[PDB]
Design a protein around this ligand. Structure first.
Ligand SMILES: Cc1cccc(C)c1C(=O)Nc1cc(Br)c(O)c(Br)c1
Ligand SMILES: Cc1cccc(C)c1C(=O)Nc1cc(Br)c(O)c(Br)c1
Lengths: 115, 115, 114, 114
């Protein structure tokens, strides 16, 4: 029920091998590690979680943009891109978090569907 | 070798039933109709053309954003969104033209791959 | 009543010395030249028109993104960027057309105020 | 040396009276409050800091997008928008952090000039 997709606006390509860390806000207001992974050759990251495990909560999807651009030997502006949202509070939904990256800019959108 | 995808930044959903017209610049410098279609329930428009027909040229992908937003009963700013590019000039490529829509803004990117 | 602003998402800067041409749609559906200029050091292009000249109608703002990128040694995807909209006197009176450029992407918004 | 500008892609306007909080990363990796304010009628927030105070380091700009949308009667997706970056004295000296808001999307760029 959670997928992350990342595209590269400089290369005109998927953003491959982008590290993504997902956190969930705990009872004590700390960010607890929830899941992580890397984008594939398609720019997509599938299989982060399950419908059982992806309960209601406030989630943070941290897209490691600096590490991405540095691995390409480019000096970027941002440390990361974060997307923070409440999920599943009206029951289970499916979420795609998409991001488009440039060295000094990024854009994100969500696609939320009810299965 | 050509796919168009449109998302709605207000609804957090695919932009369904968006009309898309593709033109190709003719020898006389006019825009010749090349292909057209509508986005599906996924926001994607597949099958516009073929690798035989999608020759080198300058192409214009016109995304009928005003018609989209008016069909939803919203008064938008832009008449359409255009994406104009040279295609296949180093041999055949596959192109995805993606757009993200709001009433007063849009963003587009291209993903170009070599099959 | 019309200002155009262009930014560069690769360098994190204004997009300076970018050619911008504005057209008005004529009765016969052709695009008539209306105003033009080059963005300044701030990425802004002021003084394109006046209230008296800027009547309701459909306008196209064409931004010469291809020349911009090539002058920076980058091959870009687009031939140019276009922003086509209707000026409406029932809405606010000043229009800012902003664009954010990358080699394979562009984003634009309208900021329309009184 | 730091200005934050927020625009609304739904209304085609500045995003007015939006709360913005700036933090600096401390030695212990916590976020220390640094500056805050609300955007003006132009969507801009000026005067957050001074050159003397704005030393190299990692900063976070948090924009209270959720309150903004709810005050307009819209349920938005995000809890807030964050922009996290490093200030580097080897680059240009003035930073503008711009954000463009929609209910389910945001876009941001940095304009860094001398
Ligand atoms: C076109 C765009 C604009 C602003 C932000 C983003 C993330 C995009 C974008 O690349 N969206 C996008 C989302 C999905 Br889901 C896709 O399968 C593709 Br192709 C593009
Ligand atoms: C942050 C952004 C996202 C998508 C598209 C655009 C054009 C922008 C942007 O850079 N907007 C912007 C608009 C004005 Br008016 C400004 O004075 C600045 Br500085 C940035």
């Amino acid at each position: 029920p959670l997928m992350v997709k990342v595209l590269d606006a400089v290369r005109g390509s998927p953003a491959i091998n982008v590290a993504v860390h997902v956190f969930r806000k705990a009872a004590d207001d700390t960010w607890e590690p929830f899941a992580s992974g890397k984008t594939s050759e398609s720019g997509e990251l599938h299989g982060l979680t399950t419908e059982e495990e992806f309960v209601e909560g406030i989630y943070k999807v941290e897209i490691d943009t600096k590490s991405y651009w540095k691995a390409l030997g480019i000096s970027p502006f941002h440390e990361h891109a974060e997307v923070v949202f409440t999920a599943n509070d009206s029951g289970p939904r499916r979420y795609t978090i998409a991001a488009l990256l440039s060295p000094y800019s990024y854009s994100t959108t969500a696609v939320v569907t009810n299965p």
